[PDB]
Amino acid sequence: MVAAKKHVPIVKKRTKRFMRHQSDRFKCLDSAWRKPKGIDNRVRRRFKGNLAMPSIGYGSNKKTKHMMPSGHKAFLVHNVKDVELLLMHNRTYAAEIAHNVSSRKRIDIITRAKQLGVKVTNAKAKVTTEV
Amino acid sequence: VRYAATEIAPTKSARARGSYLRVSFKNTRETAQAINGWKLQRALTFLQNVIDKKEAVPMRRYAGSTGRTAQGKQWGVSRARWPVKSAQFLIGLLKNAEANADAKGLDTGNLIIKHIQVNQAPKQRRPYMSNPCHIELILTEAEETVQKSEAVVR
Amino acid sequence: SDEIVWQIINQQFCAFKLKTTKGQNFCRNEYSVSGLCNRQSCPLANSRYATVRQSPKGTIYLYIKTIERSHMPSKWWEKIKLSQNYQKALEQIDQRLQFFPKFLIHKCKQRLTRLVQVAIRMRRIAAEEARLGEKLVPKMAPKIKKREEARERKALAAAKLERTIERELLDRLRQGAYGDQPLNCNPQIWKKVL
Amino acid sequence: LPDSLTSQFPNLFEPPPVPKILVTTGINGTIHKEAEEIASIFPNATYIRRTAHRYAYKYSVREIAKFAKNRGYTALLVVQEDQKRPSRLVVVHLNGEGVPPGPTLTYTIRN
Amino acid sequence: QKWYPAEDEAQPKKVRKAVRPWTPRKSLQPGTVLILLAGRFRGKRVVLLKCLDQGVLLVTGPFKINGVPLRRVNARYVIATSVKVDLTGVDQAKIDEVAQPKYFTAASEEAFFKQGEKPQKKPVSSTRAADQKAIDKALIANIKKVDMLASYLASSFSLRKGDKPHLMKF
RNA sequence: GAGACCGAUAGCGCACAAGUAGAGUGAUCGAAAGAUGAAAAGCACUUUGAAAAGAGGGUUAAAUAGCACGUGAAAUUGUUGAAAGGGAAGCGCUUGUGACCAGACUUGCGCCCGGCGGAUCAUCCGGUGUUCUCACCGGUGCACUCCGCCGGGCUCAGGCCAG
RNA sequence: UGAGCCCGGGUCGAACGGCCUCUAGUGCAGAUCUUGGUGGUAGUAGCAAAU
Ligand SMILES: [Zn+2]
């Protein structure tokens, strides 16, 4: 037995993203959400068949917020001292090695995390197995 | 996983390039599209028979209504034109690729035009703008087939 | 002044604080019994404190800090060796941390349990990697990878693979390496060679 | 001033017997078709997976080498993957009779 | 136990959910002919020997008449007919023996060399085969004594055109 | 001599040929334009041909860094592959099909024997630092105790989904 | 919830990030917005000043 904690089932109220209105038509408009401010904008007036806007009713359960599908929460690590901070939180948190960590430091983090019982999300990074 | 279709061997292909060429991009593109996929000698005869007036080049995308004759019956296109300078540049690159294949050690009687690409070159700053082009063609050998041998019993 | 240093640490700045965007703060201090920034777990804002730490030798100790040595940063902690027997170590923690807050006692027992479990897991892992013989090594560096790609491209260009194979097969055909009446070629082809 | 080669490797360098090849993968290998094709390259080669399901025993290369030596196999090939593509080739010569398993040659598969 | 709780893992509260015996349908009597609706013996008519627990039924379609071995089946996957065969002579001790919930239950060189190979389909038994024969002996005798029933149990049930299960009298 | 300034559409119009090129009869007006590489080692030579162009080949750590030169976005374009359509396309919710990609619990602990080796074991000896009662070394041995390691035996706990 | 943030793969070649405070020339879809680049019209109209 080594997994995440016992947690209530993870329910996502909405899996799709909220796209900005008319952002699929214009290349100058990024898909990041912007609240429409026009008076006659039917997205803002919430007419039928239009885009929904983000609301606080779409929020996630506080017991499963920030939680991965495995049940752990992501903990960004830059060195070995950072994974050592998860000695007492091995079942609640998983190690996420930072993108600018070198290969040997990544090997050090992965080795220590395995001994501590901490899962690593990106353990298939720039390393390989030698026999 | 899925593996992409690997390239043919460099010992079985011959590449020619021409960069910053002072010919029109649209006419050269249509001429290159006409000869795309053909045998080498057929393309030689077509470009030499379009330099001196017998044969037509059809236009499909960059098509301007200029001529409507019977020479477009074989291509199915009612719009046919005869660019001249693009034919000379394609001829020069085709003999360049022939020389490359002869030097490399390829059979020049079984050469086919695998691919020919016309890209846009930087525009000539003189409001009248010239449209030069880059041309990159790759000839290959005809695919060779070997008869199998019957399997042995064990 | 435990409360005043707690307000300064918690509300302004602490060098041992790791602020995460996931709903919890962490304590980077080595003497923190739980690596979490809260009022009860602070080794600095609590004058009487207790933690459990493991030496590089593998011996696990209990560290106790009192208020009467608080002006003595080189003499902050007294170190007591804990027994290898788990139950006897639990009773040692109970005996030495008598009349302490129950939070410190509870977290000390939990930290000792986790350290012993990590030691057992480390021994099992070391045995498994000793048996398997596998080991993680770094991949090729990008400069070395680019070097190998460029020089492999040049070596493939200079190899002339199909021409070399055809030449060596014809050479094997000339020198009779396939023997008289070769099964490879047609009889007319062998007639032309002679 | 070869002699050093045949002194160092007397098993490789009195004709060798007919080869029987065992081809395997890494621990939780996903290249089954690739390793089967690499085995299909060599005559008299069988491909056996190394772990069966996800949570089974992890056999080592030395154990598999001893197992195949006891079953008359001549050499063991291990194909190691990276990003679900073959990356390394490990060739172990099992030898025969009283000779121990011989030299191990590790190559990298790139293209 | 051995370890102090190393993390604040909350124990579950005591649930007030007790286990009471399953009450079967009035049509599920010992000896009732049952029509199976699912499985690999789907549509075959068997004879119920004993009703077990939590919905499970011990059924056996005399192997000689129809190829259905001594097996278990959920009651929600069977249709109880009006025909009940007499079980006089069938040893209830043998039925009780097979009705226990353990009857239908079960790193080296060969372990490695068997990886990737197809598992062998196991032959049955020498005592389970005798158990089937022991129950079938009296059952088949009673079924033959019953008029026309042996040909009924050997035929698979199926729905024809125009037949409505809601208006039937199974 | 400096700065909580600006960083090549910014900062003086001007980081570079800048009051230059250029415009106006004239008074005047007034731009754009920085970055190869550590080092030119700036591509010899063979071979097409008339090109500010190629193919081999070479220098370099690297030439998909070749004086169009650090990186190299988008608009727009070409080659290849896949799919759909010809009385608008595009969007919201929900399944399906095809292709591609990922890979679920990181999958453990406790007891009972036998052997071995260490110790916090020995009211064993000596030494060092100390918060002066706690730690750390060196040498002895296994009567007791406690840890590990190896060979057997047993129990338990385990993630998700259906009935 | 969201503005956003973190990781993988490729390219690349010399600097950069989190946290607590301080500071501002600090956040763009539009202004017949400014500068640069690039299109359909269109290989069309026409061979006209320039080229
Ligand atoms: Zn703190």
Distance between CA atoms of A76 and A93, rounded to whole angstroms? 10
Token pair 């949570």 is at which residue? D55
- CB-CB under 8 Å, E5 with C117: no
Distance between CA atoms of C189 and E50, rounded to whole angstroms? 84
Report DSSP state, residue B109.
T
* Chain-centre distance for alpha carbon D47: 10
Distance between CA atoms of B144 and B12, rounded to whole angstroms? 11
Distance between CA atoms of D48 and D57, rounded to whole angstroms? 14
Distance between CA atoms of C10 and A40, rounded to whole angstroms? 48
**Cβ–Cβ under 8 Å, residues C6 and C41:** no
Residues in Cβ contact with B112 at an 8 Å cutoff, skipping those fewer than 6 apart: B37, B38, B39, B40, B139, B140, B141, B142
Task: With CA atoms as reference, report the closest residue to A113 among A73, A74, A71, A85.
Answer: A85
Distance between CA atoms of D99 and D75, rounded to whole angstroms? 13
**Cβ–Cβ under 8 Å, residues C53 and C31:** yes
User: Is A63's Cβ below 8 Å from some Cβ in E?
Assistant: no
Resolution (A): 3.0
Cross-strand bridge partners of residue E61: E68
The single-letter code of the amino acid at B110 is: N
Q: What residues of E are in contact with residue C86 (Cβ under 8 Å)?
A: 2
Cross-strand bridge partners of residue D85: D82
Task: With CA atoms as reference, report the closest residue to B118 among B25, B44, B15.
Answer: B25
Write the CA distances from D26 to A130, B2, D61, integer angstroms.
10, 20, 9
User: A5 CA to middle of ligand 1, Å?
Assistant: 25
Distance between CA atoms of C29 and C12, rounded to whole angstroms? 17
Q: Determine whether the annotation assigns residue A108 to a binding site.
A: no
Q: What residues of B are in contact with residue D83 (Cβ under 8 Å)?
A: 1
**Cβ–Cβ under 8 Å, residues B108 and B94:** no
Write the CA distances from D80 to D24, D55, D74, D86, E103, integer angstroms.
9, 19, 20, 6, 45
**Which helix (H) or strand (E) segment is A74 a member of?**
strand A73-77
Distance between CA atoms of C59 and C83, rounded to whole angstroms? 8
User: Is E9's Cβ below 8 Å from some Cβ in C?
Assistant: no
How many angstroms separate the CA of residue D3 from the nearest CA in chain E?
38
**Cβ–Cβ under 8 Å, residues D35 and D24:** yes
Handedness of CA A85, A90, A96, A102 (dihedral sign): positive
Distance between CA atoms of A85 and B24, rounded to whole angstroms? 67
Q: How many CB atoms lie within 10 A of CB A43?
A: 16
Distance between CA atoms of C127 and C121, rounded to whole angstroms? 10
| A66-91 CB burial, b ≥16 within 10 A, e <16 | ebbeebbbbbebeeeebbbbbbbbbb
Residues in Cβ contact with A54 at an 8 Å cutoff, skipping those fewer than 6 apart: A18, A33
Distance between CA atoms of A96 and A86, rounded to whole angstroms? 12
Cross-strand bridge partners of residue D81: D86
Distance between CA atoms of C171 and E63, rounded to whole angstroms? 73
> Within 13 Å, how many C-alpha atoms sit on residue C134's CB side?
17
Residues in Cβ contact with D107 at an 8 Å cutoff, skipping those fewer than 6 apart: D88, D89, D91
Distance between CA atoms of C74 and C47, rounded to whole angstroms? 15
Distance between CA atoms of D88 and D35, rounded to whole angstroms? 11
Token pair 């290349």 is at which residue? A27
**Cβ–Cβ under 8 Å, residues A53 and A35:** yes
Residues in Cβ contact with D3 at an 8 Å cutoff, skipping those fewer than 6 apart: none
Task: Look up residue B151 and give its two tokens.
Answer: 């399997």
Task: Look up residue E39 and give its two tokens.
Answer: 């499985």
Q: Angle C54-C55-C57 (CA atoms, 0-180°, nearest 5)? A: 125
The SS3 call for residue B14 is strand
Distance between CA atoms of D15 and D9, rounded to whole angstroms? 14
Q: How many CB atoms lie within 10 A of CB E86?
A: 13
Token pair 């990008």 is at which residue? C142
- Please state whether strand F lies within 7 Å of residue A111 at its CB atom: no
Q: At what angle do helices B25-35 and B85-104 cross, to 10 degrees?
A: 50
Task: Look up residue A20 and give its two tokens.
Answer: 């900005």
Preceding-residue numbers of gaps in chain E (C–N over 2.5 Å) = 106
Task: With CA atoms as reference, report the closest residue to D83 among D42, D34, D36, D37.
Answer: D34
Q: End-to-end alpha-carbon separation of chain B, Å?
A: 34
Distance between CA atoms of B20 and A104, rounded to whole angstroms? 48
**Cβ–Cβ under 8 Å, residues E56 and E31:** no
Q: What residues of D are in contact with residue B1 (Cβ under 8 Å)?
A: 83-85
**Cβ–Cβ under 8 Å, residues A76 and A108:** no
Task: Look up residue D50 and give its two tokens.
Answer: 């190394």
Cross-strand bridge partners of residue B61: none
Write the CA distances from C137 to A110, A128, C75, E73, integer angstroms.
12, 5, 43, 55
- Please state whether strand F lies within 7 Å of residue B118 at its CB atom: yes
Of D28, D57, D69, which to mutate for an interface test with E (greatest number of E Cβ within 10 Å)? D57
Å separating the CA of residue D98 from the C1' of nucleotide F23: 99
Distance between CA atoms of B15 and B137, rounded to whole angstroms? 6
